Subunit: 150 residues, 6 copies
């Protein structure tokens, strides 16, 4: 449906490099609606829950340590196929292999400093949204631009 | 071969969302020359002729109704391989599947509100140009830049 | 009223330099609505009528010769105080004295190649619009955008 | 270098998709984002924020509009950020705002002015305390040697 | 239309990745690049560059900073390019520079004001001679009919 | 591996069309560090050495003649995988087949006027850097943004 939602986190590197506005603008221009937005410094608990699927992996510690190393801009966007579209707009895991035009393709070089990370699926998105945002922090009335949907 | 021409129409949704300038700029930056331009509200007969290839399709009535629902900005651009190039610059049928960097990839989310449409072939381009424009509305003297062509 | 209109002409230099889209986008982003648009090569009669106030000035011939020397993109924009606003967005007569941020301030260096010219008053706008466009080429209804106007 | 100001992207700015454009302008300028959140203001929050205009005829409509939809509240930090942020926005009448400024580039109606910033340090501190909780604001920052001497 | 000015994107401008942004602004304006190179300025070059301030206490600071890292030196040609380039940059204090100007859009501190241009034709000729060898400057340009009448 | 370097040349057409800043900005935004930069008019000897691999090609003369026909902006960028990344950011040989988002995809239409050319390998990059720049023209002290590499 056109009410699908995804969670996007502009990580510490993205925030430190002043790419917050650039990124938000790309999603606004696309037609997706911002239903949740806030800057915070993630706690270790939040970080470990966010990357829970990788808890047994060697790089787990580094992922958690980095996303908690500084301010992060957390956001939720709503729109048709937003989860898959947001991932396409970001690029692939490795910024160097991402095509120009994509966020990582235009601004990143390292996998561990890949600027932003979005939900990999609807299931993960619903899980992440509930983890990072309280219900009261999410819009309940969403009406995009009627020129966007048939 | 550098005199090839194609027909492009910023549809009602593209105009309503204020994307006319953005789109024209992309083609200008590319090196293509504007040889025809005008804003108009398509009539039903023009729309039905324009979309004649889908006259039997179930979504035909919808295509016609929408393209005639508001102002459209019709354009004709000239340049080497402009027909196929213009299509590549627009993206693919489904905006959600279009790569970032393309017009639809950057601004669209629904197939029925795909922002802009270009001729799919030289054959179609010549037909569409004659259908939407009068001879006197098209430049006869062009010759772009020596910086663009060998 | 919110239905005030002004006439803007991207002159041959602006068109040749590929600034048409850039210019249209600036006015679209501002909130003004395009109600008339077309590219044409002005006739001497049209040019002389357009610059009638300067009929007895030494530079009259030059203004006329230049605006008819190549394609021009004529447009009409509608919105509250659009006449004075469009002039402000363009800059002052001399591009070198125009502040960065304005069209001439950002793109021009010569008075005779000042890219674009807008109506200097509501009276001139109405005169110019009727001169460059036929009634059938102008949108009749626009309906105020709730996000732009009270 | 620790001065802070409160900026609110109004419902019209949010609805027109100008949030990113605006944040980018302040990031590019060199100011640091120390507070950020989207919310739909309540009547009380709106009236307190715009208390200085409470006696004016348009106050009712002003309050009704800012509470009509989502607003993106922000706090930016940097030397002279209060006056600088105002200069970047333009003047009260968007039509009189010079191109290059936010209102100059995007607005046409005084009642749909896109964004509003604190007019003084005193007002900024009041507004910041009104819209944000202490824990929602950064306490770090770390001076950037490329921005300040 | 042969007038020329010297522009130096200082270490802060280079470190902040604004070299392309700045060059693009002058290219779009219609001015022609007739000299360009990145270098790390030496003390003797810097002291001559800021000679008008040699008796002032901040002379040492201006010299130390412009020689602290990579600088992109450029020479642009065009009608009234000296005064125009200054207007495009803004005023000495970036906080007081209007949005739309380089310093107005990107700077916050006087000592980190990103770029500096010649203040007069006399200074431009003097500075161009100090920073560039004749062989590093274009001799063939040819006025663009779309920019000049 | 983060010290890898590549040679990029904005050819006469790219310079003449005013794309130098646009191009440099793209590489700056990506995170790569500018370690060498200068505008010059290549000599025949430099050109023939640069295109040595095509000495027996029928188009060799044309490549040499064009790159020496006007000012060129030569540059060297440093960063992880910069050689392959720079090529990807430029696009493919034929600008018409280059994807929107890439330099050639956004600005070119002719193979012979492809705007910019980058080293095709580390081997070629080191050869080209030594050919176009003296060691003293290249930075030895490099400090990329601290948020770019893990
Ligand atoms: C009152 C002002 C703009 N405004 C908003 N609505 C109106 C209206 N109907 N008539 C006149 N002015 C109006 O918005 C408040 P604000 O949003 O704070 O903008 P400002 O730039 O801070 O302006 P001020 O210093 O006066 O607070
Ligand atoms: C696990 C993934 C990539 N990754 C990030 N760091 C590492 C590492 N050290 N080893 C292997 N993989 C690594 O990072 C999480 P993420 O940055 O979210 O990438 P995604 O957007 O999910 O593709
Ligand atoms: C038939 C085509 C896309 N299309 C494909 N299927 C549909 C549908 N169900 N509703 C609306 N449009 C649809 O629309 C005409 P067009 O707008 O020209 O798109 P194109 O550039 O040709 O891909
Ligand atoms: C008369 C004015 C400027 N002008 C343009 N060319 C000349 C010239 N040769 N001598 C003196 N003035 C000149 O041009 C008309 P215009 O380009 O419309 O400027 P405006 O937007 O009306 O300020
Ligand atoms: C002297 C001027 C500003 N300035 C720069 N640093 C200082 C300082 N510490 N005290 C007083 N003035 C200072 O810097 C030279 P510049 O950066 O070239 O400014 P300009 O573009 O010439 O206006
Ligand atoms: C041989 C290749 C493209 N080319 C292919 N054929 C030609 C031709 N006839 N004229 C000019 N260039 C031609 O040009 C070298 P280059 O411009 O470096 O492209 P590259 O980035 O190496 O792919
Ligand atoms: Mg992930
Ligand atoms: Mg079609
Ligand atoms: Mg005039
Ligand atoms: Mg106020
Ligand atoms: Mg100075
Ligand atoms: Mg090559």
């Amino acid at each position: 449906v056109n009410k699908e939602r995804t969670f996007l986190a502009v990580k510490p590197d993205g925030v430190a490099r002043g790419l917050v506005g650039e990124i938000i603008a790309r999603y606004e221009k696309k037609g997706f609606v911002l239903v949740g937005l806030k800057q915070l410094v993630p706690t270790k608990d939040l970080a470990e829950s966010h990357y829970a699927e990788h808890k047994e992996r060697p790089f787990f510690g580094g992922l958690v340590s980095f996303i908690t190393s500084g301010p992060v801009v957390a956001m939720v966007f709503e729109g048709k196929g937003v989860v898959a579209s947001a991932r396409l707009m970001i690029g692939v895991t490795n910024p160097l292999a991402s095509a120009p035009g994509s966020i990582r393709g235009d601004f990143g070089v390292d996998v561990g400093r890949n600027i932003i990370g979005g939900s990999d699926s609807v299931e993960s998105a619903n899980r992440e949204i509930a983890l990072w945002f309280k219900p009261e922090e999410l819009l309940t009335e969403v009406k995009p631009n009627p020129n966007l949907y048939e």
